[PDB]
Scaffold this motif. Structure first.
Motif, mmCIF file in Angstrom:
data_model
loop_
_atom_site.group_PDB
_atom_site.id
_atom_site.type_symbol
_atom_site.label_atom_id
_atom_site.label_comp_id
_atom_site.label_asym_id
_atom_site.label_seq_id
_atom_site.Cartn_x
_atom_site.Cartn_y
_atom_site.Cartn_z
ATOM 1 N N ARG A 16 -77.603 37.950 -23.429
ATOM 2 C CA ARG A 16 -78.425 36.603 -22.868
ATOM 3 C C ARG A 16 -79.493 37.093 -21.778
ATOM 4 N NH1 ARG A 16 -76.428 35.230 -26.558
ATOM 5 N NH2 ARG A 16 -75.643 33.554 -27.404
ATOM 6 N N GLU A 17 -80.256 36.546 -21.458
ATOM 7 C CA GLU A 17 -81.561 36.798 -20.240
ATOM 8 C C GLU A 17 -80.634 36.311 -19.241
ATOM 9 N N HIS A 18 -80.463 36.857 -17.959
ATOM 10 C CA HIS A 18 -79.450 36.687 -16.759
ATOM 11 C C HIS A 18 -80.583 35.925 -15.964
ATOM 12 C CE1 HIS A 18 -75.700 37.591 -18.270
ATOM 13 N NE2 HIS A 18 -76.255 38.541 -18.873
ATOM 14 N N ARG A 19 -79.859 35.031 -14.891
ATOM 15 C CA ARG A 19 -80.814 34.328 -13.623
ATOM 16 C C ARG A 19 -81.396 35.630 -12.802
ATOM 17 N NH1 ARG A 19 -80.112 29.897 -12.486
ATOM 18 N NH2 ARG A 19 -78.611 28.392 -13.345
ATOM 19 N N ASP A 20 -80.862 36.461 -12.795
ATOM 20 C CA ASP A 20 -81.055 37.664 -11.787
ATOM 21 C C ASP A 20 -82.183 38.746 -12.244
ATOM 22 O OD1 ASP A 20 -79.779 39.261 -13.264
ATOM 23 O OD2 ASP A 20 -78.427 40.174 -11.865
ATOM 24 N N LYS A 76 -72.940 39.520 -19.776
ATOM 25 C CA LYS A 76 -72.198 39.091 -18.166
ATOM 26 C C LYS A 76 -71.280 40.296 -17.822
ATOM 27 C CE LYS A 76 -72.426 36.195 -15.395
ATOM 28 N NZ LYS A 76 -72.842 36.238 -14.356
ATOM 29 N N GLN A 101 -72.437 43.262 -16.112
ATOM 30 C CA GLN A 101 -73.161 42.972 -14.864
ATOM 31 C C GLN A 101 -71.927 43.717 -13.824
ATOM 32 O OE1 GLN A 101 -73.819 38.823 -14.274
ATOM 33 N NE2 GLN A 101 -76.042 39.527 -14.200
ATOM 34 N N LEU A 116 -79.324 28.527 -16.632
ATOM 35 C CA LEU A 116 -78.392 29.637 -17.174
ATOM 36 C C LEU A 116 -77.037 29.324 -16.824
ATOM 37 C CD1 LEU A 116 -79.054 31.821 -19.273
ATOM 38 C CD2 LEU A 116 -80.992 30.746 -18.207
ATOM 39 N N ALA A 117 -75.996 28.717 -17.567
ATOM 40 C CA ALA A 117 -74.534 28.454 -17.187
ATOM 41 C C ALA A 117 -73.779 29.358 -18.194
ATOM 42 C CB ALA A 117 -74.102 26.989 -17.289
#
Ligand SMILES: O=C(N[C@]12C[C@](c3nnc(-c4ccncn4)n3-c3ccccc3Cl)(C1)C2)c1ccccn1
Ligand SMILES: [Zn+2]
Length: 204
Positions: free
Chosen positions: A27-31, A117, A120, A177-178
């Motif tokens: 996924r594309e992450h919040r950060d 995830k 990370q 993004l959850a």
């Protein structure tokens, strides 16, 4: 140790299954890739089935205890794990005693249904200081390792944005993004089934 690694051929349907789960759950992450680097795909170099009789007996035994406490249902998931302890984990099993009590959902072993995830956490919390050689969290050169593990969740406690699972529960399901995070508080509630050696791929 008692751990044997079985190298899977790339043309093996088993390799392909784990490979597809890894690639398809990015996924594309919040950060914006601060933690795990910038990429939308991986270079999958090696997938090895981790084989350890003692760790498997430990896992199945706990799985049975959990099922009896959860209406004859283990609530077993295949999830990704990332940490700087992968080489220790495949030999000695997961170990709650090494869990950090400051983490988002307390002193637990964290898993994700999204490979990106768990990516990370490969080099520490928030990708720590990045790769040992270049100190680069977005390093495209250094080879990373994830585990794709059999995890017993049992009765999971939903928590939003803790030494053990709450009473009557066997795990924690987080949702910040959850992207779903899963936490266990006993090392024997997870078997590290596949060791995946990879790199993040530089986008064009
Ligand atoms: O299971 C072992 N180590 C851990 C698997 C661990 C882990 N899982 N999730 C997290 C974790 C994930 C997210 N937030 C906070 N903790 N951690 C963890 C614990 C301490 C430092 C760094 C990490 Cl990644 C504890 C790293 C282990 C360590 C040594 C020998 C055998 N097993
Ligand atoms: Zn590097």
């Amino acid at each position: 140790s008692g751990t044997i690694l079985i190298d899977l051929s790339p043309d093996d349907k088993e390799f392909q299954s784990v490979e597809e789960e890894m690639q398809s759950t990015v996924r594309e992450h919040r950060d914006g890739g601060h933690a795990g680097g910038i990429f939308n795909r991986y270079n999958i170099l090696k997938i090895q089935k981790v084989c350890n009789k003692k760790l498997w007996e430990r896992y199945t035994h706990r799985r049975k205890e959990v099922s009896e406490e959860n209406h004859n249902h283990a609530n077993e998931r295949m999830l990704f794990h990332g940490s700087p302890f992968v080489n220790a984990i495949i030999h000695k099993g997961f170990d709650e005693r090494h869990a950090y009590i400051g983490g988002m959902f307390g002193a637990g072993i964290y898993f994700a249904e999204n490979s990106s995830k768990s990516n990370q956490y490969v080099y520490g919390i928030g990708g720590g200081t990045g790769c040992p050689v270049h100190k680069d969290r977005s390093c495209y050169i250094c080879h990373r390792q994830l585990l794709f593990c059999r995890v017993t969740l049992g009765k999971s406690f939903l928590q939003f944005s803790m030494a053990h699972s709450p009473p009557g529960h066997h795990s924690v399901t987080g949702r910040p993004l959850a992207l779903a995070e899963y936490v266990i508080y006993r090392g024997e509630q997870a078997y590290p089934e596949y060791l995946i050696t990879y790199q993040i791929m530089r986008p064009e």
